[PDB]
Amino acid sequence: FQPTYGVGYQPYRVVVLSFELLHAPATVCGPKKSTNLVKNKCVNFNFNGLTGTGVLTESNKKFLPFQQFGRDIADTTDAVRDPQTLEILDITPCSFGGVSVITPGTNTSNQVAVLYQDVNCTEVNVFQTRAGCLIGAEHVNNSYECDIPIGAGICASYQSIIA
């Protein structure tokens, strides 16, 4: 080898990578991509192969350092540890509630009110009951006989629709 050589006689360093895959567990992988953690939103989470959909909030549950996920009685993952920063997050299902329609007779009126059962009013004439969030009914301080039952001591009537 001289430096005055032409191309084709110059030295060439060659590395041959042979990826072989025996049925032992695989330990050579690429870089696992990660994205910024977004909290308090219904997102699809994928934590170390455990996937799902939920709202990831801060947790007061103190995990032991070898443990990663958390399960309730019904064996559903409700707690998890973030692998980047060792913090505990309580997965909560993206909120679901019954949508009930409170109406008088259509001979009487076409006005309706909507009850979102077990749903807070901040994430859906808006009134918060223990039965749920009631939209379209004017809450009054007067007490009457129950006409249309809502629940938890709340009843609706037509006079507009009042609750």
């Binding site: 996937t51 799902g52 009685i73 019904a74 064996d75 559903t76």
Partner: protein, 49 residues
């Protein structure tokens, strides 16, 4: 055990609800109990089965 009659009703209702949620973890002879695993692992002609 004075109020056992109400407690039996409460325990039976909670146990029925608990068993109903425990039935979601069974695959019933399928390859997995998770729908998302089936949708991610298989083509729709076997996934429908």
């Amino acid at each position: 055990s004075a109020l056992g009659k109400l407690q039996d009703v409460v325990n039976q209702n909670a146990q029925a609800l608990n068993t109903l949620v425990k039935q979601l973890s069974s695959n019933f002879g399928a390859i997995s109990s998770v729908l998302n695993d089936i949708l991610s692992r298989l083509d729709p002609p076997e996934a429908e089965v």
